[PDB]
Amino acid sequence: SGAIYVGNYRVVNRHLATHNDWANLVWEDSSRDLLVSSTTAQGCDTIARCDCQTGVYYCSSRRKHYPVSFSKPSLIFVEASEYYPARYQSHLMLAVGHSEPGDCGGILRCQHGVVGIVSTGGNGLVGFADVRDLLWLDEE
């Protein structure tokens, strides 16, 4: 579990979105595993605006933050998990590291702020859903 809180937005994995998220929907995209809902209070997070390929991510299944190198957001085939069939996911970054299903929502961060959230795992990789292209998160 985990979310990004930027302005009056809550950014979550689409597959972990609550009824309250869907009832306050701003934008969702299954291919990215992202959903954004509206909040009443303002959030503490800053979104990175950059093409960094190094950062640090939170792994709940280890209670640890790990420094990683990661690929640029791409369209990638993801094998079946407890929450999705095998499919193509877009805007996905991969790194070498530990990821189980419950790790989804952990933040990946660089020197510029939040890059994305854990969205995939298995076979020694962790996949992150990028948010740095979503420039509208920074306003309105």
Ligand X SMILES: CN(C)C(=O)Cn1ncc2ccccc21
The correct pick among 98, 112, 122, 125 for binding Zn ion (CB under 5 A) is: 112
* Identity at 29, one-letter amino acid code: D
Contacts of 84 (CB under 8 A, 6+ apart): 15, 33, 78
> Is 19 assigned a ligand-binding role in the annotation?
no
Torsion sign across C-alpha atoms 89, 95, 101, 104: negative
Strand segments (E) across the chain: 4-6, 9-13, 25-29, 34-38, 54-59, 64-69, 74-78, 87-96, 107-110, 113-122, 125-130
Q: Is 104 one of the catalytic residues? A: yes
Dihedral-angle region of residue 33 (phi above 0 means left; psi in -120 to 50 means alpha; beta otherwise): left
Mark whether 15 is an active-site residue.
yes
76 binds, among ligand X, Zn ion, none (CB under 5 to 8 A by kind): none
Within residues 12-31, the interface with ligand X by CB under 6 A covers 26-27
Query: Applying CB under 5 A, which of residues 52, 56, 76, 125 lies at the interface with Zn ion?
Result: 52
Per-residue contact flags (x/-) with ligand X for residues 120 to 139, judged by CB under 6 A: --------------x-x---
Residue 104 binds which entry of Zn ion, ligand X, none, CB below 5-8 Å type-dependent? none
String of contacts with ligand X for each residue 67-106, x by CB under 6 A? ----------------------------------------
User: Is 44 annotated as contributing to ligand binding?
Assistant: no
Please choose, from the candidates 36, 33, 11, the residue with its C-alpha nearest in 3D space to the C-alpha of residue 24. 36
User: Which residues sit at the interface with ligand X, rule CB under 6 A?
Assistant: 26-27, 134, 136
Catalytic residues: 15, 33, 104
